[PDB]
Amino acid sequence: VQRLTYRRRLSYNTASNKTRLSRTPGNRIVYLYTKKVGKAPKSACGVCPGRLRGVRAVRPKVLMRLSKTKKHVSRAYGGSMCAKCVRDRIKRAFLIEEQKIVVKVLKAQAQSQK
C-alpha cells in the first residue's frame, strides 16, 4: 500500500495541519491540505441555539470575497437575527407601545379628574 508524507514542514497533526487523501491524474495518492470548517452566524437574539439560514457558512475572512446576497437575507434584521425573534420583537415592540399609550390615557384622565 502507498503510504504517504505531509507536504509541508509542519510535522505535527494540529488544527492547522489537517489533510485529505486525493488520487491525482498521475495515479498517486497525495495529501491535499484542507480548509477549516466555517460556521453560519448565530442569532442576535441569543436564546435561539440554532444557527442562521440562507448564509454561506464559511471562514470569516472569506466573507470579504462573497457577494452581499450570500452573506445575508432579505428581511429586516437580515442574516443578523432569526425570523422568529424578529416577528416576536415586532409584535412585542408594538404591543408594548400600545400599553404605554393606554397608561398615558389613564394618566391624562386622572389629571382631568383631579
* Cβ(45)–Cβ(6) below 8 Å: no
Of residues 27 and 111, the one with the C-beta less far from RNA = 27
85 binds Zn ion (CB under 5 A): yes
* 42/55 Cα distance (integer angstroms): 11
Write out the binding residues for Mg ion, residues 39-98 only, by CB under 5 A. 54
Nearest in space to 38 (alpha carbons), one of 72, 63, 67: 63
| Those residues with Cβ within 8 angstroms of residue 112's Cβ, 6 or more apart along the chain or in another chain | none
> 55, 58, 82, 86: which one contacts Zn ion (CB under 5 A)?
82
Of residues 40 and 45, the one with the C-beta less far from Mg ion = 40
83 binds Zn ion (CB under 5 A): no
Of residues 16 and 22, the one with the C-beta less far from Mg ion = 16
